[model samples]
Structure formats: structure tokens, C-alpha cells
Target: MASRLLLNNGAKMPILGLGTWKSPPGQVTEAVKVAIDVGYRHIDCAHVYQNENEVGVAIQEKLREQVVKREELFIVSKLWCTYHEKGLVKGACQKTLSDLKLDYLDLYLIHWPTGFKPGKEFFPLDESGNVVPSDTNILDTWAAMEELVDEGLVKAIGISNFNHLQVEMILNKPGLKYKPAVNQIECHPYLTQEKLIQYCQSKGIVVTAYSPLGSPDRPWAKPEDPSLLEDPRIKAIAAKHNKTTAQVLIRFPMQRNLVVIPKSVTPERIAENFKVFDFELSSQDMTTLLSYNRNWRVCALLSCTSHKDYPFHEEF
Candidate 1:
């Protein structure tokens, strides 16, 4: 339903994809099935999400029914912070592949720069409520991640929640064998990230905007927080375009030529989110939308801010 963007490695990714960040377990499987039925070929997921098995069930059934073959679908998953140890990279990818019931992933990302203790807890912490730090270097983790491509466990690799400076470190590694193909970050009208986006684009890397709708349904959302969907300015633009504020938000990133993943488990809303191909936002409207930037990030990982490798502390 939408045009695709080519990554640095020449792999084609849809500009609009379905994000599974917080998709509730009970409804995610059916949601994936419905999304595929309605022409969604790309699905974003991660080990941290804890719903990959359910998502895999939907994928298996879709293929069994001949809805779409393996090659037609572009599935993405990520390695969690707890698994950032050099020796644990393969094991983490193996577990994710087992959960997804797939031999290889289209793309795999380093979930975050902050590395926790190498065992079970996603957020291994100390008695003082601080994340237990691991001596693992994220670059060392990336060095290990490269071996997955060598072993054919994944087709491509990238990073997530990394700031421009953090990514530059990876890009400038002395013996770098593969450049990161994408950077998945919290991006929306309020947090435009224009400079960082341009920096990434200048280097031939693509940007994948997570929380494209501002993550209004995020788990920790406060009652008094701003509502992106209910913003009068956005609503006015949506009215002018004869579209829902949701469609406008989804289209905003696509219009910038960035990959976008808007998560939803509701069947109707999932389909509605993909209905932005019929219309286009004008240049004037794009300018107006850009002016709404407030540098506000929705998915701030506050607990990890103290970590030496925390990526968000730098100005993006």
C-alpha cells in the first residue's frame, strides 16, 4: 500500500510498517493476522516486547494459508540490553529466532546502548534501584552481532535508541566490517530530530521512527501529558486533509522518507493506520507540522540516564 525505502545494503523496507512494541499478548496474534490480511508486509518487533511467540503464530498461519510467502514479508526483531555481552549475542539471536519460528530475521537491532547484567532480568538492578552495570562494551557487542550475518542468522543489522554520537562511534570503528543500516528512534512531530536525521541521511543510513503517533498509550503515560492525537493544531490539519489525526501522524514520517511503525492491536484501527496512501500532505502543511517541534521525546529511558553508555544524554 506504500512505497518502500532502500537501505544502504540494498534491502527494500516499507516506509510504513506495523510496530509491536506494546501490543498486548492476547490481541497481538490476531492483530498480526488482520494486518497481513489487509496488505501489511512489514512487522516490527523485539525480544523486549515479550509477544514475539504470539506474533510468530500469526506469521506461521499466514504462510500456511498461503497469504504471503516468507520472502514477501519483512520481519524485524531486536537483541535486548541484558544480552549485550559479546558471548551472549548469538544466544540472544537464537532465542528470538526460536520464538519467531523463523530461520532468519530481515533485520536485527541492538535494542539499546545501555548494557545490563548478562543474565535473565531485562533490567538487572542493584539494591539501590540502579541498573546493574556490565563491563560489556556495546562496540564489542556489535562485533559479535556481525557474526550472526556470517552465520546467516539475520539478513541485516542495525541499532536502536542510539544518539548521533553513539552511532558515529559505531560508524567510525577501526575495523568496522558493516555499517549500521538503520537507526530506530523515538521520533514524532514534537521531537522532530531534524539535525540527527539529516546527519544519518548524509551517511546513507536510514531512520525508522518508532512511537510515530507519540505513544499516547505508553505504559507510563501520565494523565496530564500532552495528547498528540487530540492536539488542536494537528486536528485542524487532519480536518483540512479530510483524514484522521492518526493518518496525518503516520503520513508525516512517510512524507519525510523515513520508515514508520505505528502500533495498534485493534483490527479496524490497524487497517485505518495504513490508509494514508490515498492523499498527500502539501509542502505548506509539512512546514506547519515541522513548526510544531518541541524536542519532546515520548520514550525516555530515565533509569538508564546515569549509565556511561546511555545514548540519550547527548544532544541529538
Candidate 2:
């Protein structure tokens, strides 16, 4: 609740949002509903999550009963790799808007830098998969994305999983109507991203940290991600404050003014993550966490090697 991000476009964003991914199809509706009930105003979603209808239905219900107003929430949904083609971008956002039952998104991200072949799916079954030409470019799609805002569809547009060079490409594009307001990256003590974070900050592109706790239990993710909970250093620091390692991990980036999304289905854990806004991490602890940097990536679910993009591994 206390965390927020200031974008290049001068928009304020909730630092902590609910990340809806691999949530069971049947449980998604109540999940969004319950999250709203639990004081969550920022909801990070994607069309690929395949639960937009339930999430949409929940939003409509909340609005009808006056549970929460539209402006009171910061809802983010991304244009997936399938829709990375610039010509398809409009229909892509339209589909998400239609599914989400919203007229405008507070933020819409270019989900990946790669431009995969349409309808091929992320984990395709062939070796020569997602092999789009690098010369094709994401600016084509970004141009359309900025048009969405100019046309009054999205209030802001940001980039997710884009590297420094890719971010700069957009920043320097011709006739670029809107610069990317954020570059969301996998950030944690293991992936401190100090230079990248500082770089994005300098560009006025707010940086949001995903997988703040090392994302040990992410659906379809590797559970053996070195078990952040068992890391002796993180545990020792937590013990000093009578807190858990997740607490320290969650708060570290928040203190640096970066947005963070830590997913949890359990009610208690959700409450615990939200409670981080109530306190601050000490400077020593912050540096102690910085020392744990291993440049780890928990959800490189769609890397260039795993997929192809316009700037595939080229940046952005």
C-alpha cells in the first residue's frame, strides 16, 4: 500500500500488485475478488493467463456493488508475444480489454521483446520455434502501443523483460509518442540489478521488480531455485529482526523505490507481503542483501534462446 513508482510520464503506480499466473482456472474469479477484499488495488494480469474472464467478472461485480471504483485500482495487462506483431497489436489490446471488461488499462506492457510467430505458443513443440527475424523490430509494435494511449485506450505503456539497449531503442525512436514508463525485470537479492535499475531510473523509466522472493514455487517454474528460504545469509538477516527471509527480500527493492510483485495464493502469505509497507529495511540490511546478488533469473519463461524476438537477445 505504501509502495509506489514514478514513471517518466509522471504517473504514479502501486509498487505491490497481485500477479495472476498459473492460478487454477476455476479459482481465478474468487481469487481476484478475495484479493480486492484484502486491500489489493494493483492487479497484474496477462491475456495468456487464460483467466481474464473470471478476473473481468470479478471486476464488474466489484464495480456494481461499489466494492471498488475503477480509478481506485491500478490494473496492468500485457500484450503477449503472439501479439507482438505491430499490425496485430490493436486487436491484441482490444481482446484483452474485451476480456478484462475494461475501457482502459492503467499500464500495458510489451510482455516480451521477442516477436514469436502468431499462435505458435511459448513452449512450442519444434526446434526451429519462435524464430522471427531480428530486423523485424519491436518499435513497429511499440509505435502501435503508443498509438493506443494517444487514441485513448491505455493510460500508460511500459516494457517487461526488456534490457537496457532495448529500452534505449524505444527511448530514441522517431515520432515516439510516449516513452516507456517502466521496464519490469526479474529482481531479487540474487539479481540485484543495481546498474540496470539505476539506468532505468536515469531514463525516467521506472523499474519494477518481479520474483522478489526468488519465486521458488512459481507454477511450472523450477522449485529447486536454490531455495531462497534456506539461504543462510538471508535467514540470519531475518533473524536479526525476527522476520522471515521473504520479508527482507520483499522490502529490499521497495526501499529503493521500485515496484515489486510477489505472488502468493495462501491468505496468510498475501497478508504478510502486503504488511511490508508498514516498515522499512535498514541500510545495512539493504547492503547485506545487495551482497547476495548472483544475477539469478527465476522466470526466464520466454528467453530468446527459448524463443525469438525482434530484438531477440539484442536488447530491449
Candidate 3:
């Protein structure tokens, strides 16, 4: 059985969720179906993924087959950077809802702390090939997110890829009606994010680990990049537990009590990633994994580092 963490807002989120970031449209639908059939109740999606419509198809088929009920599943989608203007937040969320075929999202997160030029281009670029930045303040964007909860468009509101300072700014906003229930970030043994995770948890915001397996398939990966899945140290630990390296990576965050979303479209790997509950990592093993943290990030948004609200500048 899967475990769940109770959010500050009284909703329980499954500790393990299927990540749909790079899963293509053609494969994501079947991946969702296979995940549901394999006992997955949580799905992490975003408008930028460009596959919510395909994901919706799998969800509709599952609901039609009575394999799961709408209320039993926790669906999460994100508002892209280009949609950060207060006026655009709702429509951006509605577009995702329409694509996902859902009346409401269980949790909706601002995809990042920075905003882009408000337009249709997902990544508005200039002649210099740099990402165009917008002057919209995230506080204004956050105000709109709170309205989403008030209007019953989402059960909970949260933020992703936010640094500790950015999260605190939201918490301290005047007239803030709803506190963020979660802060999703890139986390793995390589980028353990110890300080950020502790800070968010101290503030009653749960942390969700994205790229939990180091996102080996990220588009910008170079040949010399270290592969987390094939690390010999983790492989030895997996051998001790008789589990795959992927399983050990997934279990690392689970043992730390954070939600983990590992992406995969292959049936065997998807099913394998969900088998983490069967074994427990020893405290020594946990320490070994934590010791490997070199603060390396696989999903660094280098293109927008110059944006005013860019989050990685802070120590946390």
C-alpha cells in the first residue's frame, strides 16, 4: 500500500506520484493508464508539458472503466511562467482544466518564481536568443492563485522551483488568504536540497521531489554528466536491499517524508518505481546518500537566470 502525507490544508497527498514532465503525448496516455492499473493515485502535470490532453484521455478511460473514482485521485497541474500576470492566471488554469477534463485540480502550483513576457510562446525569446523577462510581480500572481482556491478551481494552492526566500515572501504577503501547501523542487542525491527542504517543512509546506532519479533523460544532458542511476555506491545499497537503483533513489526521499515523483514511460520501469514500499533504507544508507550531495541541479533554468525573481540566487 502507498503512504500519504497530510497537507497543512487538510488534504492528503500520496507520497509517490507519476511525473509527466518529459513523457511525450503519444506515450503519456498509456503511461497514465498503466500507472493507475498499477495502483498510482497521484499524477503531477503541467501546462508546459504539452501532454495534459493525452493524459486526460487515459484518466477518462480509467474513470469510465470504474477502476478509480475522481475523488480517489489527486491531480496536480501547474501554471507556466508565461501566464504569471494576474489576469492570465485563471485562464491558464482553466486551459489546463479543459485539457485535463477535470472540473477542478487537487493542487495547482506556479511553475516557477519568475515570469516571462505574457504571450503564446512558451519561451518568449529576443533577437539575442535570451529569454524575455516580464515585470509582473509574483505576489500579484500569487494573489490570483489564492482566488483560484476561493473560486473552487483547485483544492490547494502551492508553488514550485521556489527558493526559501521566495517562499517566505509569499508567506509574509499582506492579505494572504491561503498558505502554500507544497513546494516542488528538483531533488535527488546529487541535489539533495537539504536546507530548502528543511525550511519549507518548518513553514508547514510539504516538499515534493522532482527529477528524483536525476532525470537521466533531460534534453540538455551532456555525455560527461554523472549518472545517478548507475552510481556504484547506490547500486551497492540497492544490492543490500535487493532493489534496483531507481527504487533506492525513489525511497531516499520517501524515507525523508517528502513526496517523490519519478518519471518513466516504460511499463517495466514505471511498475518498478512503485515498488519502493516493500523495503526500508537503513539509517547508515540514508546517511551515505545524503553525503553524496554536491548541490548539483539537473533542471537549472539557465535561460532565465537574469529574471528579477529568478530563485536560485539565494543560499537556500
Candidate 4:
């Protein structure tokens, strides 16, 4: 059975899940179907993937075939940058729910700290080459997110790619309705994010690690980019445990009680990623993985660096 962590709201989320960020629409449906068949009950998705409809088909079929009941599956999706405006937040979530063919999402996250101009285009641009940012405060966007929970459209709500200061601001907001249940960020051996993870945990917020394998398949990867899978330290630890590098990486975060979502559309890889519960990493093994941390972020949103609310600028 997969491991689970209880959220602040008394609900539980699987510690291991399949990430659908770059899973192409043409393959995501089959990928989700294969994952479900292989005992994966948690799926991480977002409207930005442009593949939610395809993913929904597989989920509906699985439910229809009695492969898993609705309550047994944990579905998570994010609110995109363009939908930060209060009026658009619910509409965007509703659209995501409609696309996923689900009555509600188990967890819904604000995709990023930066808000963009509301439009059909994913990234809005001005006459010059710059990202158009809205003056709307993210707390305002967050207030709208709480509405989803109140209306029963989502079970829990959280933030993604937010920094310590940003999360603190939300938690300390004067009229804050609901504290974020989780903070999903790019975490892996390369970017251990110990301080930020500790801070969020101290505040009772769960942390979900995305791109836990260093995301070699990321589109922006360069020829000189280091591959965490091939790193000798991680490899040596995997050898010590007689496990694959992927298993070691996945186990690293789960040991710290952080959720991990590694993206893979390959059926074999999907099953392999979930086969991490049998062994536990020792203190030394965990330290070896920690040594690999160079604070490298795989999904650095460099395009939005100029945006005032960009969260990556902080040390945490």
C-alpha cells in the first residue's frame, strides 16, 4: 500500500504521486490509465498542462469500470497565473473541474506567486517584450481560492512556488480565511530546500516536492546541465540500498514527510517510481542525498523574474 500523510484538515494525501506537468495530451490519458492500474491513486495536474481533458477521460473510464471509486482517488490541480483575479479564480477552477470531469478537486493550488493579465493566452505580453503583471495582491487571489472550499468545489487549497516571506504574509493576513494546506515547490536532491520546508512545516503547512528527479526531460535543460539521476552520490546511495536512483530520490523526500510527484508517462517507469516503500534510508544515506544539494532549481521561472511578486528572489 502507498504511504499517506494527514493534512491539517484531517484529510490524507498519498506521499507518492505521478506528475502530469509535461505529459503530452496525446499520451496523458493512457499514462493516467496505466498509473491507476499500477496502484497509483494520487495524480497531480494543472490547467497549464493543456491536457486535463485527455486526463479526465482515463479517470472517468477507471471510475466507470470500478477500477477505483471516486473517494479512493486523490486529484490535485492548480490555478494558473492568468486566473489570479478574484472573478476568474472560481471560473478557472470550474473550468478545470469540467475538463477533468470531476465534481471536485481534492487539492487546488495557486500556480505561482505572480499574477498575469487575464486572457486566453497563457502568458500575456505588452507591446515590448515583457510579462504583463496585474496589480492585484495574491492575498486577494488567495481569498478567492478559499471560496472554492466554502462552496465545496475543492477539499483543500494551497500555494505553489511561493517563498517563506510570501507564505508568512499569507498566514499573517489580517482577514485570512484559511491557511494554505500545502506549499508545492520544485524539490529534489539538487535543491533540498531544507529551510523553506522546515518553515512551512513549522507553520503546519505540508510540502509537496515536484521534479524530484531533477527533471532532465525539462524543455529548458541545457547541454551543460547536471543530471541528478547520474550523480555519483545519489547513485552510490541507491547502490547501498540495491535500488534505482529514482527510488532513492523519491524516498529521500518521503523520509522527511514531504510529498513527491515525479513526472513520467512511461508505464514501466511509473510502476518503478511507486516501488519505493519497502526500504528506508538510513541517517547517513539521507545525509549523502543532502550533500548533493547545491540549491539547483529545475523549474526556474526566469521569464517572470521581473515581476514584482516573483518568489524565487528570496533566499528560502
All candidates: TM-score = 0.98, 0.91, 0.98, 0.97
Clashing residue pairs in candidate 4, if any? none
Per-residue CA lDDT of model 3 for 105-136, tens digit only, reads 99999999989999879999887677898879
For model 1, residues 132-175, the per-residue Cα lDDT tens digits are 87888778988998889889998899999888998899998878
lDDT tens digits by residue: candidate 4, 8-32:
8678999888999889999999999
Q: Model 4 — which ten-residue stretch has the worst lDDT?
A: 1-10
Q: TM-score winner among the candidates?
A: 3
Error of 3 at 199 (Å): 0.5
lDDT of 2 by residue, 99-183 (tens): 9999999999998787666765643334654344333467898998998998878899999988788888888899888889888
Given candidate 4, what's the lDDT at residue 190?
A: 81
Q: What TM-score does model 4 achieve against the real structure?
A: 0.97
Which is the leading candidate under lDDT? 3
Comparing candidate 3 with candidate 4, which one achieves the higher TM-score?
3
Stretches > 4 Å off in candidate 3? none
Q: Is candidate 2 or candidate 4 better by TM-score?
A: 4
| Model 1 per-residue lDDT at 84 | 86
Which stretch of 10 consecutive residues in model 2 shows the poorest summed lDDT? 307-316
Candidates arranged by TM-score, highest first: 3, 1, 4, 2
